[PDB]
Amino acid sequence: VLIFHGKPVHGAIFDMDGTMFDTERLRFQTLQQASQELIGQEFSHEYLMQCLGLSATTAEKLAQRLYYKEIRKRADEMELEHIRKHGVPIKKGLVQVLERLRKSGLRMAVATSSRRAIAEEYLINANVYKFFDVITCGDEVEQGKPHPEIFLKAASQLHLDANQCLMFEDSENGLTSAHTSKGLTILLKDIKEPNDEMLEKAHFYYDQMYDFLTDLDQFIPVMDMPEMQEPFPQSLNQLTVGIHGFGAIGGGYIAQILSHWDGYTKPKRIIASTRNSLFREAVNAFGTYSIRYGQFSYDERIENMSIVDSDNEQQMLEMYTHSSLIALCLPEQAIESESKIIAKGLYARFNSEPLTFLIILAKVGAKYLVMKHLKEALLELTNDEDVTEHILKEHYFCDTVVNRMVSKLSNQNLYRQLRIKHNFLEQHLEDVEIEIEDCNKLTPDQLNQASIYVDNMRRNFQPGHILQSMDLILFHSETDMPIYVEKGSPLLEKLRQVVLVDQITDIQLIKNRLWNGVHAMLAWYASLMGYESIGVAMGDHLVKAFAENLIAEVKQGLAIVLPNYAKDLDRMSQSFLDSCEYAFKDPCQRVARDPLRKLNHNERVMASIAVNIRHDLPYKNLLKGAALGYAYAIQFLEIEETKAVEHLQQQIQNLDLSTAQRRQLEAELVQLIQYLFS
Amino acid sequence: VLIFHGKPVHGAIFDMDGTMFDTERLRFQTLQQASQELIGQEFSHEYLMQCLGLSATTAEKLAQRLYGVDVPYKEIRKRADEMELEHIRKHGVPIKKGLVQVLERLRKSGLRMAVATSSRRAIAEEYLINANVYKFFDVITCGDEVEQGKPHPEIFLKAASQLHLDANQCLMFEDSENGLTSAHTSKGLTILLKDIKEPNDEMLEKAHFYYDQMYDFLTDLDQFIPVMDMPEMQEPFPQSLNQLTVGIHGFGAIGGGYIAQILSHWDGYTKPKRIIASTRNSLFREAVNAFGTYSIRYGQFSYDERIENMSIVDSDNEQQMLEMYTHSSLIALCLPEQAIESESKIIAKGLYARFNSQLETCIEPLTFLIILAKVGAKYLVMKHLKEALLELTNDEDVTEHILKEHYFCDTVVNRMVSKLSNQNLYRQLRIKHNFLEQHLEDVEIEIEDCNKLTPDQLNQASIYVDNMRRNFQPGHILQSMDLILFHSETDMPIYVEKGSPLLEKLRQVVLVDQITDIQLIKNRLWNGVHAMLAWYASLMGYESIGVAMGDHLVKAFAENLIAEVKQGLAIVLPNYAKDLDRMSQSFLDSCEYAFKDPCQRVARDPLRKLNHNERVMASIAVNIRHDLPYKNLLKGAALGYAYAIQFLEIEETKAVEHLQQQIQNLDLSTAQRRQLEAELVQLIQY
Ligand SMILES: NC(=O)C1=CN([C@@H]2O[C@H](COP(=O)(O)OP(=O)(O)OC[C@H]3O[C@@H](n4cnc5c(N)ncnc54)[C@H](OP(=O)(O)O)[C@@H]3O)[C@@H](O)[C@H]2O)C=CC1
Ligand SMILES: NC(=O)C1=CN([C@@H]2O[C@H](COP(=O)(O)OP(=O)(O)OC[C@H]3O[C@@H](n4cnc5c(N)ncnc54)[C@H](OP(=O)(O)O)[C@@H]3O)[C@@H](O)[C@H]2O)C=CC1
Numbered sequence A: 001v002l003i004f005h006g007k008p009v010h011g012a013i014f015d016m017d018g019t020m021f022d023t024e025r026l027r028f029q030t031l032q033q034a035s036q037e038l039i040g041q042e043f044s045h046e047y048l049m050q051c052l053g054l055s056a057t058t059a060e061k062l063a064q065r066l067y068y069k070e071i072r073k074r075a076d077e078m079e080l081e082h083i084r085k086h087g088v089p090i091k092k093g094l095v096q097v098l099e100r101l102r103k104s105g106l107r108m109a110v111a112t113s114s115r116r117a118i119a120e121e122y123l124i125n126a127n128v129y130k131f132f133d134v135i136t137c138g139d140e141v142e143q144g145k146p147h148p149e150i151f152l153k154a155a156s157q158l159h160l161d162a163n164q165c166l167m168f169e170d171s172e173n174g175l176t177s178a179h180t181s182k183g184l185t186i187l188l189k190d191i192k193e194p195n196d197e198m199l200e201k202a203h204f205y206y207d208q209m210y211d212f213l214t215d216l217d218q219f220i221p222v223m224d225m226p227e228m229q230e231p232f233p234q235s236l237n238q239l240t241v242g243i244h245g246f247g248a249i250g251g252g253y254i255a256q257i258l259s260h261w262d263g264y265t266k267p268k269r270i271i272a273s274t275r276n277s278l279f280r281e282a283v284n285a286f287g288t289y290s291i292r293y294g295q296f297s298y299d300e301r302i303e304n305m306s307i308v309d310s311d312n313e314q315q316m317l318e319m320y321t322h323s324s325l326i327a328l329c330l331p332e333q334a335i336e337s338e339s340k341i342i343a344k345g346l347y348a349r350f351n352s353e354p355l356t357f358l359i360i361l362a363k364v365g366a367k368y369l370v371m372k373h374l375k376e377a378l379l380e381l382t383n384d385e386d387v388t389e390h391i392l393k394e395h396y397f398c399d400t401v402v403n404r405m406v407s408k409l410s411n412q413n414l415y416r417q418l419r420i421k422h423n424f425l426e427q428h429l430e431d432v433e434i435e436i437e438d439c440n441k442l443t444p445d446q447l448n449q450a451s452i453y454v455d456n457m458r459r460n461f462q463p464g465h466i467l468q469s470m471d472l473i474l475f476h477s478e479t480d481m482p483i484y485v486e487k488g489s490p491l492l493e494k495l496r497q498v499v500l501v502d503q504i505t506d507i508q509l510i511k512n513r514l515w516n517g518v519h520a521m522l523a524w525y526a527s528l529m530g531y532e533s534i535g536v537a538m539g540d541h542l543v544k545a546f547a548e549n550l551i552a553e554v555k556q557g558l559a560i561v562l563p564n565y566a567k568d569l570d571r572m573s574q575s576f577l578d579s580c581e582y583a584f585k586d587p588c589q590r591v592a593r594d595p596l597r598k599l600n601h602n603e604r605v606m607a608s609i610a611v612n613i614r615h616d617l618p619y620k621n622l623l624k625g626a627a628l629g630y631a632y633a634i635q636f637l638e639i640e641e642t643k644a645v646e647h648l649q650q651q652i653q654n655l656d657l658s659t660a661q662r663r664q665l666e667a668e669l670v671q672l673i674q675y676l677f678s
Numbered sequence B: 001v002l003i004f005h006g007k008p009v010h011g012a013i014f015d016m017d018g019t020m021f022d023t024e025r026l027r028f029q030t031l032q033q034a035s036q037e038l039i040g041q042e043f044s045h046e047y048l049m050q051c052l053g054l055s056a057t058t059a060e061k062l063a064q065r066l067y068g069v070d071v072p073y074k075e076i077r078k079r080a081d082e083m084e085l086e087h088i089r090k091h092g093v094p095i096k097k098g099l100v101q102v103l104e105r106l107r108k109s110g111l112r113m114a115v116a117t118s119s120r121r122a123i124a125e126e127y128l129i130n131a132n133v134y135k136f137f138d139v140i141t142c143g144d145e146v147e148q149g150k151p152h153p154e155i156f157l158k159a160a161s162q163l164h165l166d167a168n169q170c171l172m173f174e175d176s177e178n179g180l181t182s183a184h185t186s187k188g189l190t191i192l193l194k195d196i197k198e199p200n201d202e203m204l205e206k207a208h209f210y211y212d213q214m215y216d217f218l219t220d221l222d223q224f225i226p227v228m229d230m231p232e233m234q235e236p237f238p239q240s241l242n243q244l245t246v247g248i249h250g251f252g253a254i255g256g257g258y259i260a261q262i263l264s265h266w267d268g269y270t271k272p273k274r275i276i277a278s279t280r281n282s283l284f285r286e287a288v289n290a291f292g293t294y295s296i297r298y299g300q301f302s303y304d305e306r307i308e309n310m311s312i313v314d315s316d317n318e319q320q321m322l323e324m325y326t327h328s329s330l331i332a333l334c335l336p337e338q339a340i341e342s343e344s345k346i347i348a349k350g351l352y353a354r355f356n357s358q359l360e361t362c363i364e365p366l367t368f369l370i371i372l373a374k375v376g377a378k379y380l381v382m383k384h385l386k387e388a389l390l391e392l393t394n395d396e397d398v399t400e401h402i403l404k405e406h407y408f409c410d411t412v413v414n415r416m417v418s419k420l421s422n423q424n425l426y427r428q429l430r431i432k433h434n435f436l437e438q439h440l441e442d443v444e445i446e447i448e449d450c451n452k453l454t455p456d457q458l459n460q461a462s463i464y465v466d467n468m469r470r471n472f473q474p475g476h477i478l479q480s481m482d483l484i485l486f487h488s489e490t491d492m493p494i495y496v497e498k499g500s501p502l503l504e505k506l507r508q509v510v511l512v513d514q515i516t517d518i519q520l521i522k523n524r525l526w527n528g529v530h531a532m533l534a535w536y537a538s539l540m541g542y543e544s545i546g547v548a549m550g551d552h553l554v555k556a557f558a559e560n561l562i563a564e565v566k567q568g569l570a571i572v573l574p575n576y577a578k579d580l581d582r583m584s585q586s587f588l589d590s591c592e593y594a595f596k597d598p599c600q601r602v603a604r605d606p607l608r609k610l611n612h613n614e615r616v617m618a619s620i621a622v623n624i625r626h627d628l629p630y631k632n633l634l635k636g637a638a639l640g641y642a643y644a645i646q647f648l649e650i651e652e653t654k655a656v657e658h659l660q661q662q663i664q665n666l667d668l669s670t671a672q673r674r675q676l677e678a679e680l681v682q683l684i685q686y
């Protein structure tokens, strides 16, 4: 039992033509073309408008009143031929509605004036026949629309009263049929502006299918955080989504968040951008890729992926125009150069529902950096101050905090994979090296045709049978589900794996200092000791002790800067050590990336050191980590010892300290850097 | 976290060659094949057995003593190494039987796992990727990454420290003498596994636990890891495949729409690599093999359940049907009662071919599940199987041996399933052939330059992706396109006779010592109400149960009738309290939209169903003996005799003669007997 605007609902009976699918517009075209090549004169627009939601038998009776079997047969042949080429034109929101009504526990059916042969054909093609317990067609009914028998029979077969059932319809005739049955009427405009008579009959009215979905969803229970190995939804909506940067986060975390979606439907398409062509071609070659969760040896297949080139404009604009939600999964260095491709996308969207823009970036005030470079990019292209500030305040730009640690596979390891799995494909194509016999309730022509279908289906699918076991592994991800996003976008309210928060800035700072800062400094210490794995490195008593000692010095500083969050630091720090403890497939190199950027004055290392000096706290271990960062940059990255000091001096000069504290810090740090080398 | 023989285990470190993979026997084969090519005479089995444990130099000097000083041993050894990699790369690394089953058990027990191999990183990593077992291991410690290899404990000590564990917290698996010394010295719980050569007395004394093979350790490990809970609806199947094959003798409604799911869930750790199902239907066989898979539809939740790793065979094909009984570890007989006598010949040939076969899959007995609705079903099959074996074998001792060797299991099934029509299947293939044609419109490569890769391997990478794309791209559509062949209900648990060790870990199976208890509940609660409801619907002019449940009188009667029978069974069988409550709702859910469920077949042979010990009269006597309401049951009995007289044209005199005879057989007081008779005949009037 579902409560929809106070009234209790047990079932939901749907109309097919004009309500579920846009087949009424096609029937309008076919009947016109059919008449032109038979009788010569096209049918009156008044006749066709009166024949909407009317049985083929009842449509012929109207033709006698004005002035059909020969006409309608060829018109039906033209229609199903158009459907076999272009597919059934599914109204936007149908699949999203049907699943919500099914999982609410409603007993659903279809009441259409079309034949059982034509009705099923479209219900099968669209893949929505599985949502209905019964269907009532314009064949087994005695008195067709606008008589309520078809809507009474549909309700009776569901073992419910019509007054307990919702009834969807587009036509004027069909609405009367739904109303006289005495069920909760819903009217969806298709090819007739509702009359005063029609609007009075209908209990609820909506301009399109997606308008009803929005109204329904406020009564539908919003599903909660998915579990690790929990499946994604089966049914697909007509919405697209984007991943600007098919990297560790985009491919190995966001892909799961988007694939789960609301738990009712998934995006039909996920467009992801990368310049890594091997990654691009490999995913598109397989059709899917898998995220490996090493802790539980679980491979998570991500399907309905379309990997595109980042430099290729038409494909990037394709994403920014069609996508309902796009995730920006780029590091700081990429923001400026990529802001130009973002600017083109959003301006193309204006030229073409508000976009939900997720900024996934490990920086304090990540949105500001993106929005700064976006404004500069848009203004330089558009050359209009008004159109830019409209775009900037139309779309939902959301800050995020991601706790999950994800790793991108190397091109050598992906080549090693492709090489090994190609040998299996070659051998499979040798092992493979038909006649549908017996008159099994079929005609000889059907059996002959069936044989040809199965022959070329086997020929096409047989090579791809190996994909049942064979997966394309591209990411090593930990089992951390919940992403923390800013409040604003109504779409994010219903996303399962999203947890909305208020003051993100406070969390971003703690994430930067306590999480990202210690992660980088132990990764430098681990790298210099000869560890290539974070997980293995944490098996060393010295490496873990250093991380514990750093955590202690950072929390002591954050406890003064954020006394309101002091209570939660011990939990956050312990959660970090756990994630590091068994990060075996997570390479130190990935975390130790760009030491100088991370050794900036307003970043995860020097910011903590500054706080501790001001408040007379110990920064002994924090000072060592800073030196190990410059030691890593000179040794592993080969950046020069002269440039290291010119960065050290510059960034220490930018710190909010007295000249006394600066002199001491620089002298203490430069001595400790020379000590490690000599 | 995982207790193994009273010892807390947090780690598991495996040797690679001889312990995980059967690479020692592959090296044997190649060395002989390589010797046959070059020197003309292949190296003796006895020489290669003598070489196990010895170094390459000691092995070379031994080859010189036997086959002459100028023997090209290094040339033969290199050729053998080349033949080994070639076979491993195309046909796959030979995995020891039961490894994946063990690795999943240890991993789901939360153990950190490593590989300690004297092999070099490059070849070791390829083998683990090839076998698809690398996912299971956190770290890997190689011979080129230690100063002192086996028998020095460094490689096992390093592996343990990399997992943040002491050696004594780790299970250490090994086949070779030196490796066991390395594992033992380190202080780990050593598990010695025989590969080819019987281990010496010193090795057996050293080892904490010894097993003839992996599967003997798997059987021991099963005692320390749990049987998983009853699968829920929409719960995924296991990801990892084991090396077992299973069979469905009769790819029908229940075979493909229920048993397929049970076998696909298996023990929740792994599932069979192949499910061989038999059918005479060409369209079904050729369609499933073309897709490589089919799907089961659950209307209630609108869920399409995809059954992977299926292989449909012809029921009239001997070589295919014999291969089922030869290769399968467990077979399910999903035939009707009419098909037993005919197929018993094909069963006899199968089990006799298994008896005659010298394969390793036929050494262990067969677990035979009898999926048949009739009481004493197992024994009907056993009768026909005995007759069919005798006439084929012409040997009474061989016939009886086979009948006593295998596990024949009675089963009680509660899931109603309907097989799709060939007309509806043809339509499904026609509609989803247009989508294939539509998909092949779009299909009509370059990986630029990484710079991280070399042009030689970068050019070669283009060949792989292009070849993969050309073959896989047509089958991209299968992502969200299924082949629906079965409409099934949401009932999960299958009741099976306890006995077969292979059933002890199957999670969707409910093991019972005697099937009689749940088969009595199936008779009275399910089939009894089904018959009494069908009679009520028929006399009120309804052809299907599905249509009838729309009537408030029919659904109200069904609900009230379920309550009376359940209340009785709760006193008779209080140990099945949870089973009664579950089976009650399952019946009412299935009845709701049972449009393909005619009353005639459910209402056939009424007088047999109205017997004193049968599904109607027995329930009345129980409810009377325990003072419970039987008003709906009494109405149910009346409708049966009424249905017999009106529809089946049974004489009223014949119905009463039966009615009275059944009442007098019931264990009631002479007073209670007469009362029921007077009440029942009074209702038959109306
Ligand atoms: N990975 C993690 O565990 C977490 C990281 N983060 C943060 O989220 C963001 C995700 O970055 P991540 O995906 O980890 O890094 P990756 O390198 O794994 O992927 C980065 C993406 O950005 C693109 N990119 C990288 N450098 C440039 C550049 N100089 N110019 C243009 N495009 C570029 C890459 O394109 P191509 O594919 O062609 O290289 C790739 O698509 C970062 O800010 C990261 O710090 C957040 C928390 C956890
Ligand atoms: N489905 C249900 O509702 C339930 C079924 N059961 C029991 O399971 C058993 C099978 O049910 P179901 O699967 O519906 O039976 P089906 O008729 O659907 O298919 C049965 C299998 O046996 C074969 N078969 C059928 N008749 C013959 C015959 N006369 N000679 C040779 N082979 C034959 C079929 O071959 P082909 O594939 O070529 O037709 C098919 O493989 C029955 O005893 C039934 O009572 C138990 C609980 C409920």
Ligand SMILES: [Cl-]
Pocket (backbone or CB within 6 Å): A415, A416, A419
């Ligand atoms: Cl390689």
Ligand SMILES: [Cl-]
Pocket (backbone or CB within 6 Å): B097, B098, B099, B100, B101, B241, B242, B243, B244
């Ligand atoms: Cl196995």
Ligand SMILES: [K+]
Pocket (backbone or CB within 6 Å): B218, B219, B222, B502, B505
């Ligand atoms: K077992």
Ligand SMILES: [Mg+2]
Pocket (backbone or CB within 6 Å): A015, A016, A017, A018, A019, A052, A053, A169, A170, A171, A174
């Ligand atoms: Mg209409």
Ligand SMILES: [Mg+2]
Pocket (backbone or CB within 6 Å): B015, B016, B017, B018, B019, B175, B176, B179
């Ligand atoms: Mg060995």
